[PDB]
């Protein structure tokens, strides 16, 4: 009984799987620390990709 299988159907997750209905949380500094002049630098460490 040579069973002819269907071709392996490749499925792309494409951000469908996700928790709740809230998509992204935005983090920012306080409004009073706005910079109007000068040259400024800060770092962002990416724990995950």
């Amino acid at each position: 009984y040579n069973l002819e299988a269907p071709d392996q159907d490749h499925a792309a997750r494409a951000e469908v799987c996700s928790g709740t209905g809230e998509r992204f949380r935005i983090f920012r500094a306080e409004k009073t620390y706005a910079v109007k002049a000068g040259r400024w630098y800060f770092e962002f460490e990416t724990v995950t990709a």
Partner: protein
């Protein structure tokens, strides 16, 4: 339930079931298994060692039903099957096995699958899927 079984699979299924029942009796034989009336695992006695004819009819019914469910799931996953040739079905020819490795059953279990037998990754994945499907059915039985 919506699945329908092709006639070659009905005709194959009964002796498939008896042969696989024998296959588990030999797997437990090579695991160290000596027949007995009571069903104790620690004592090592259990009535299911015997052939399909002396196999209790209620375990026989579950074996045939699980064979039918496995083949129906196989068709339900979209995997078609056909008859390659009548020769591979007719032949059960094998080199003789020692009485230590054999039971009183006459026909030798394993066919001549030395290197020619092979499962492609799709076949192995489908074997996996059948595994969790059987596990899910068993889990629903325990939930009931």
């Amino acid at each position: 339930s919506q699945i329908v079984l092709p006639p070659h699979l009905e005709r194959i299924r009964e002796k498939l079931a008896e042969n696989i029942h024998e296959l588990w009796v030999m797997n437990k034989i090579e695991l160290g298994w000596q027949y007995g009336p009571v069903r104790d695992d620690n004592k090592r006695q259990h009535p299911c060692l015997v052939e399909f004819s002396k196999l209790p009819e209620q375990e026989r019914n579950y074996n045939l039903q699980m064979s039918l469910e496995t083949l129906k799931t196989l068709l339900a996953l979209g995997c078609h099957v056909g008859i390659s040739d009548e020769h591979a079905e007719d032949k059960v020819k094998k080199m003789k096995l020692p009485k230590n490795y054999q039971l009183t059953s006459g026909y030798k279990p394993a066919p001549m699958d030395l290197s020619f037998i092979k499962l492609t990754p799709s076949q192995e994945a489908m074997v996996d899927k059948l595994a969790e499907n059987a596990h899910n059915v068993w889990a629903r039985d325990r939930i009931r």
